């Protein structure tokens, strides 16, 4: 019996987690009022993975919702599935986030850490065998960067034998919603490398790429952007909650996807993605699904997989399908393009197939790829930081709140020290 503690740090992580809890409450059959109405008794077998029971069968999420400004907590509460969460877990603070990693790591954020770890420890202790934590946050900006990485550091210090999943939103190349994305993201990654075990990187331009070319929509909203991530988040942890053959939990995904301990940067993907105009003409099968995953337009980070070799690939199918289809189709992918897969790891793909599909749908598949192509997403931020740091710009806030030039240079140096092995293992 396994449990996962959910955390939402930052505004972006908070709406992503709100859509997450809506989607998985739909899958597990939980109403907004806390009771149960559903169709299958198989949904209640592993409800004590994400939901803790209470008096009267009112299942509440095992989630802690933290931010430095009380204008996202009331939005989450006033969402449709708002008052499912524990009101003591609404760990807010009357202050300003200030989109500042310094103010998220060495100021009011670090002042609120000592209170949010109390409810994190309570949710950890109210479990029989905890396996992992998952944290939804965004690098670009504050709170989810500063308080998020400090939460990763403290939780790794207190529980060093447990899996740390982090669903992290990285800035896009097309735009920037603030002006200090490199300054936040470099100090984010410098903590995220020597800490968490499974970083799942999400990019907004890749979300628009999916929502316009694949799903064929003209006015996508943040509900849509967080909904794709929610579907991916439900499909990563589904062999642990729903039965089937070849089950795979998060630590098995980690040991089959992380060759070297630093190399744990992944780009997720969900691929039963059909437009409304193409849903009737669709030919939904496993030979279609594997090709839709390995098509390099549905990958939810703005990195081109054709620019680098895949190190490891994991696919979690859901539905009643044949392992003839699955195993031999993934083999024909590995043989169809072999220069885009590494040779120092033979048979470098992982298969996990659930019996229960997502509701309404029949055959789904979630993609997680440890590849070379994360190097573009990281070097881009590296030269953006060199450009914005050679002239000492946007820096007096960090130097006033307590940051140092030496540790800024240390963050950039560690970013380069991870830009090195992604080239080393891609060029053998």
């Amino acid at each position: 019996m396994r449990e996962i503690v959910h955390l939402q740090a930052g505004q972006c992580g908070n709406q992503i987690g709100a859509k997450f809890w809506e989607v998985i409450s739909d899958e597990h059959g939980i109403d907004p009022t806390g009771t149960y109405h559903g169709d299958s008794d198989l949904q209640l077998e592993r409800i004590n993975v994400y939901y803790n029971e209470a008096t009267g069968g009112k299942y509440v999420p095992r989630a802690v919702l933290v931010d430095l400004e009380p204008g996202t907590m009331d939005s989450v509460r006033s969402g449709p599935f708002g008052q499912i969460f524990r009101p003591d877990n609404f760990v807010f603070g009357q202050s300003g986030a200030g989109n500042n990693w310094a103010k998220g790591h060495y100021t009011e954020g670090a002042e609120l850490v000592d209170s949010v770890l109390d409810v994190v420890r309570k949710e950890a202790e109210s479990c029989d065998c905890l396996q992992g934590f998952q944290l939804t946050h965004s690098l670009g900006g504050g709170t989810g960067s500063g308080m998020g990485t400090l939460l990763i550091s403290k939780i790794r210090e207190e529980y060093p034998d447990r899996i740390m999943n982090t669903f992290s939103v990285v800035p896009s190349p097309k735009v920037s919603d603030t002006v200090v994305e490199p300054y936040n993201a470099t100090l984010s990654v410098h903590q995220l490398v020597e800490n968490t075990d499974e970083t799942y990187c999400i990019d907004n331009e890749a979300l628009y790429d999916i929502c316009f070319r694949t799903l064929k929509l003209t006015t996508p909203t943040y509900g849509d952007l967080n909904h794709l991530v929610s579907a991916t988040m439900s499909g990563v942890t589904t062999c642990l909650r729903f039965p089937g053959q070849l089950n795979a939990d998060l630590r098995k995904l980690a040991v089959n996807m992380v060759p070297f301990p630093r190399l744990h940067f992944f780009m997720p993907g969900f691929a039963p993605l059909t437009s409304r105009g193409s849903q009737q003409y669709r030919a939904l099968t496993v030979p279609e699904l594997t090709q839709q995953m390995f098509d390099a337009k549905n990958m939810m980070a703005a990195c081109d997989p054709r620019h680098g070799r895949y190190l490891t690939v994991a696919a979690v199918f859901r539905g009643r399908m044949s392992m003839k289809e699955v195993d031999e189709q993934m083999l024909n992918v590995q043989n169809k393009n072999s220069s885009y897969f590494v040779e120092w790891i033979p048979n470098n793909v992982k298969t996990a197939v659930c019996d229960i599909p997502p509701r309404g749908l029949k055959m789904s598949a979630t993609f997680i790829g440890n590849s070379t192509a994360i190097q573009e997403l990281f070097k881009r931020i590296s030269e953006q930081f060199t450009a914005m740091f050679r002239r000492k710009a946007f820096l007096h806030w960090y130097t006033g709140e307590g940051m140092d030039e030496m540790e800024f240079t240390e963050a950039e140096s560690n970013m380069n020290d991870l830009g090195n092995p992604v080239v080393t293992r891609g060029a053998c």
Binding site: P32, T33, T35, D39, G56, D74, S75, S78, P80, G82
Partner: protein
Amino acid sequence: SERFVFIAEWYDPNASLFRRYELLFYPGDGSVEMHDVKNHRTFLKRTKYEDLHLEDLFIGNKVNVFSRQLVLIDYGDQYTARQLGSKKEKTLALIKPDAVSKAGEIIEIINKAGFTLTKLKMMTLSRKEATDFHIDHQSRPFLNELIQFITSGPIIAMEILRDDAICEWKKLLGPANSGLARTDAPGSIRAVFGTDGIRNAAHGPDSLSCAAREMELFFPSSGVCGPANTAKFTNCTTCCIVKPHAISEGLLGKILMAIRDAGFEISAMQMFNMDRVNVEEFYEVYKGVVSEYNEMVTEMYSGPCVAMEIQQTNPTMTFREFCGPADPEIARHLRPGTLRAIFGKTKIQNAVHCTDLPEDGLLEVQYFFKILD
């Protein structure tokens, strides 16, 4: 802009105090907002909701939003009090002992104008209640005729609402004399379904002051009046329910159409406002049997509904065959002629509920026509 405010209660299945909230419907685009009266905070921010309609917004109505079911108790503020205030008018309409055969036509012609329907009884008026009803014409040479007509066959009593529903229902009535209605031919209920000026189709109050005493005589506040003309033990009996769905969109007269054109003898009608614990007893034989008993429960008590007793005629085809299968989409292709084939949709929001097992028949008839008024 242009928002509508109401005050509501919700009974939480946990701690038993009635949660007091503030509902807000936006008719410009269908959106719901709720505020909290106990602590002044927000609750379900302004969000699009394509299942709440304008006709559901009424005082004492039973409205479901996000499985957090509400009952309305106040008119919000003075603005929507003006907008939907002196508008709504309660009226008591009476089907005469004649035209009970064509009851469905009359229920349908109330349903046309938007006259929303709240109470429904089928009663054989007692001897003592007649002289209470005949206060309008007391001590004039018509008591013998009007007594002999009124206390002859079962009447159907009706509670009706719309704006200035008094005069709008008088406009359906047309002239009081049915012969005068025929000679005028204005397209009134007596002009289509009358006989004469003592047996026409319908006549009731003339003002709100008379509507008060008509209401008190025919629908009491503790309840003694209607003797519940059901004939509970009639062997070939079946109890069916026009569902709160079909009542809400408005299908009652058309159901009466479809069932009387097959020769089945309707013997009793009543509308009762379902409560949860009472729905459990009518659907007692379903938990464990059907794997979605909860949706049937919440569809039953998600609004008012009319119970009715149907008397078995029309050989070979029983009521179970007239209603056919359970799901309307089973019935749409398989046996494509049933009232559950085409008078209703979905499976949650079916038209009627039958007695299923045979023996289990007088039981239902008794529940909604003996052991529940």
